[PDB]
Design an enzyme around this catalytic site. Structure first.
Site, PDB file in Angstrom:
ATOM      1  CE  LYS A  76      -3.764   2.362   2.344  1.00 47.45           C
ATOM      2  NZ  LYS A  76      -4.780   2.320   3.423  1.00 47.45           N
ATOM      3  CG  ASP A 157     -18.075   4.455   8.283  1.00 48.28           C
ATOM      4  OD1 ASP A 157     -19.257   4.800   8.085  1.00 48.28           O
ATOM      5  OD2 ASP A 157     -17.152   5.264   8.500  1.00 48.28           O
TER       6      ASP A 157
END
Length: 239
Positions: A76, A157
Site C-alpha cells: 500500500k 463504519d
RNA sequence: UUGUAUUGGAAUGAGUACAAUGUAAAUACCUUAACGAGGAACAAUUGGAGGGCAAGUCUGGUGCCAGCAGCCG
RNA sequence: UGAAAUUCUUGGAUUUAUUGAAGACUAACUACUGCGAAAGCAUUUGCCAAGGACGUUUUCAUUAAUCAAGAACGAAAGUUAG
RNA sequence: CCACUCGGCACCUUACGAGAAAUCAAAGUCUUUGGGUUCUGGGGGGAGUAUGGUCGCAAGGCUGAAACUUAAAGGAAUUGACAGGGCACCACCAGGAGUGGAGCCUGCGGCUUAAUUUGGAAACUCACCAGGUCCACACAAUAAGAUUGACAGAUUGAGAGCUCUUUCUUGAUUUUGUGGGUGGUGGGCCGGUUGGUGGAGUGAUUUGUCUGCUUA
RNA sequence: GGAAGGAGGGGUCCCUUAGACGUUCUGGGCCGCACGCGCGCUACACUGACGGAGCCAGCGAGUCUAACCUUGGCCGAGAGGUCUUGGUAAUCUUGUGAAACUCCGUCGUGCUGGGGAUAGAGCAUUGUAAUUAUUGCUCUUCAACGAGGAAUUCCUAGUAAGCGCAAGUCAUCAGCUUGCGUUGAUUACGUCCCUGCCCUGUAC
RNA sequence: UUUGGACAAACUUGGUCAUUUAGAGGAACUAAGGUUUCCGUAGGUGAACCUGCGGAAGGAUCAUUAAAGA
C-alpha cells in the site's frame, strides 16, 4: 544505492542551488556513477522506492487504485511530505491491534510511506448470500464490536463494505474514534443497527447474542468496561 | 598606374679553387683566373589566436575524462 | 509560577501593635549641571593640608615644549593574615 | 534684571574647505605636498602559540618568532526576491437533483492473442495479422526485328493477353552481364505597463509615480 | 421609478537507394476479458402499471446529377409490401394530431400484473457479404434490484428537474453530441470557515 | 755529544657543550543547536549552550510642561 541514498539524505539540508550537487554531496567516479544510474512528486516517488527495493522478492502486479492511496503479499502506497506521516500512523495502528487477538491483516514492514501486509483469501461480504451457518456468524460479528469498545475504540463504519469472508477479517479502519468521544453511543448504535439490517434483509435471520443466548444483542451501556485503553497509545480522538 | 596568376632574360655570394697577399711558419679575413640558382629543395624558426594582450561564430574528433590553465577560468 | 512542588503553620504561620540589636547603603531633589591626572566622587558638623579660574600700574628674568631609561597612582574579580 | 569681558562642560547656524562615504570647528589651513615633538601599522591564517629572558606566593603580566598554508578577508552606502484586505455555487452556507450500491451500454488502463493499429471500423476506411501474385544513371555482349499490343480458352487457398495453348500486329521508343546514387527521399513561413527636458549624487540610484480622501 | 438600472464577440550541411522507406488480391482483427478507474441508460412501484377515450408545440431537412422528403388507395397480426401523387419549397411532406399530461375502468401491497437482463423457435428489411449474428416484429424464458458506506458533481428564474422532437455522422446501424419546444418548484440575495486566485522586514 | 733559557708544534687522562653515524627500543603520531551582541576576571559541563561581579552600544524617543498694562 549509496549515491542515491545520500542524494536523498542531503535533501534535508535546506530550492536547491547547483553547487549543492558539487559540495553538499560527497569525487571521481562518484560524480559519474550518479549519472550512469540516473540516466536510466515524481522523483520522491519514482526513485524513493529504492529503500524497499534494497531492504525488502517479487514485484507482483497491479490490484487496486483509490482516491488517496494505491494498492498493488500486498503493498500500500499513499498520496508531498504528509504522505510519510499518514503511512506511519496506519502501520503502528494496525500493528498494535494485531498484537492483540483481533482478526486484522498481519503487517510485515513499513518504510518511506510504503506499507506491506498479508493478502486476504476471501471475498467481500456485500455479495454473501448463502453461508452455511449464519446464526453463529451473527453472534460473532456482534461480539467483535464489544471487544473494541472494551479496549477503548469505536469503528466508524463497521459494515459490509469493509468486511471480508469465524472466517471473517476486517480490512480497514478509516476515521476510528475513542470511547471517550461525546458522540460515542450515537456511532455505536449505528454499527449495531447497520449489521442488524443486513442479516434481516438478505439472510432473513433476525457469552453471546441472538437466539440461544439470554440477551438479544449488545447495548452501549452493557458489556463496556474500559479494559485496555488502547485509545491512549494512539490518540484517536477525544483524548 | 594598383592588385591576382602563363612565360623570358639578367644580377649575385653561400660554397669550391690556380695564384698572390697575410704570418716566426701556418689557418682565416681583404683581393682574384676557373666553377657555382627555378618548387632559386641553395626550402627560418620560436611562441600564440576568451579577457588582461596583436590575431578565428572555420572544420573534424572527444566525453568532466584525457587535458588546458602565471590570474579570472 | 505560565502551571505546580519542596518548605512554614492550631505549641498560632502570613497579617496587626509597642520596643530593641547588627551590618550595609545614602532614594525623591538629580540636570544635555559640578570636581579630579585618570581610575573615580552625593546625609550633618569639626579639624588638616592641597587646587583651577578671576583681579593686579607687585616680584624674578628665558627659568620653556615633548620625551628612551626610571618613578607614583590604577574599576571589578583574585591571593596571604586578623 | 540689562550691557560687557576672561575661563569651562555643551548646543544651534555656516563650508573658503576635507572625505570612500557616514559625516567633521577639526577629521580644515596637503600633488599650490615643510610650525615643534613622542608612539604604532604594512594582505588573511598559523598566533598573542612555541622558545629565551624578566616580574609575581599563585593565578598570571611584559617582551615575542618561523616552518607551513591561502585569493581573498575587510569599510561605507544603494535596490529589494521566496499580515491585512478583496473576489468565486469549477468555494462554502440554506437547499434541490443526484453520482458512488444492481443489470446493461461506453471510454481508458491492465490481461490475452497471429493481430487485438495508433493515442457512429462487417469490405473499403486501415494505419494491424496470415498467405499470394507484379514492378534508375555509367561500362562489356545483342538488333532489323531490340521490343510493343491483342481474339477464344486456361493455371491458385488468392489469376490475369504483363503467365500459358493458338499467332497475328508493330518497329529501335530497347535487351543481358559489370561499375559509386542519386533523390517527385530522411533528418522557406505562423499561433496592468515607460521614455523626453529639468532637479539631487563621484557613482548604482532617485524625483516625476505623493501625506490625506475615492474605483474593477 | 421603470420593457431594461443586461448577455455574447512555442509551431510549420550529412546518411540511404533494387524491386526499398513499393503495387494489388483473398481471409482475419480493431468488438477478445479474473480485474481497476470514469461518463451514462433503465429500475426498486399505488404521486403507480395496464386498457379505452380526450388532445396541444418550436427549431430543422428534403430529387432531374437524378431517385430525396412522402400524402392518398389496396394487401398483411405486425415489421413490411404495392399502385399513384405534391415539392428545388413561408406554397408540398406538415396543423410534423410529439411525450409527459387529463377523464373512465382493471389490479391491491404479495420480488406482484413492479423490473426485463440472459436464452429458444420463426417471420422481414439494408448490403457484394449479416456466422462470432445491423436493425425491426411475434410467441416463449423471467436474473439482480426492497432507495444504496467512505467519498463526490452541477445549480439562483421561465433557471433546476421531468418529457419528447429535429439535425450531425449515415447503404444499414445511438443508450452519443448540439439545438428546440412542452410542464415547471424548493432555498439565498450572504460570508471568508473549507478549496483556490489576486493586491499592499531583509543581501536574501 | 752536553748544561740552562726563550719560542713552541703536539701528546695522554678526566670534565663539559655541540655534531655525524650504526642503532636499539618504544610513545608512536599522522595519512590511506544558540537569539540582544560583546570586554575583563573567577567557577562549572563530555559538549556551543551555564552562573557570580564590574564595564560598553559597535542597540530603534512616542506624548506632555512658563506666558505680561497701577
Amino acid at each position: 544505492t549509496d549515491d542515491f541514498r545520500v542524494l536523498q539524505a542531503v535533501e534535508q539540508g535546506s530550492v536547491v542551488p547547483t553547487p549543492l550537487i558539487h559540495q553538499i554531496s560527497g569525487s571521481q567516479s562518484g560524480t559519474n556513477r550518479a549519472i550512469s544510474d540516473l540516466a536510466k512528486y515524481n522523483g520522491i516517488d519514482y526513485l524513493a522506492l529504492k529503500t524497499m527495493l534494497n531492504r525488502d522478492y517479487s514485484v507482483g502486479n497491479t490490484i487496486g487504485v483509490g482516491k488517496e492511496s494505491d494498492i498493488y503479499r500486498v503493498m500500500k502506497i499513499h498520496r508531498m511530505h504528509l504522505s510519510r506521516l499518514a503511512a506511519n500512523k496506519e502501520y503502528q495502528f494496525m500493528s498494535m491491534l494485531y498484537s492483540k487477538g483481533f482478526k486484522v491483516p498481519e503487517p510485515f514492514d513499513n518504510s518511506r510511506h510504503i506499507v506491506v501486509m498479508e493478502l486476504i483469501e476471501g471475498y467481500p461480504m456485500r455479495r454473501l448470500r448463502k453461508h452455511k451457518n449464519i446464526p453463529k456468524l451473527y453472534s460473532d460479528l456482534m461480539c467483535f464490536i464489544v471487544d473494541l469498545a472494551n479496549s477503548g475504540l469505536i469503528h466508524c463504519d463497521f459494515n459490509e463494505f469493509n468486511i471480508m469472508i469465524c472466517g471473517f477479517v476486517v480490512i480497514d479502519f478509516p476515521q476510528c474514534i475513542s470511547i471517550q468521544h461525546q458522540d460515542a453511543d450515537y456511532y455505536f448504535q449505528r454499527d449495531v443497527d447497520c449489521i442488524r439490517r443486513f442479516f434481516k434483509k438478505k439472510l432473513k435471520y433476525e457469552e453471546g447474542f441472538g437466539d440461544g443466548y439470554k440477551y438479544a444483542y449488545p447495548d452501549f451501556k452493557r458489556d463496556v468496561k474500559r479494559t485496555d485503553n488502547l485509545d491512549e497509545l494512539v490518540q484517536a480522538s477525544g483524548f
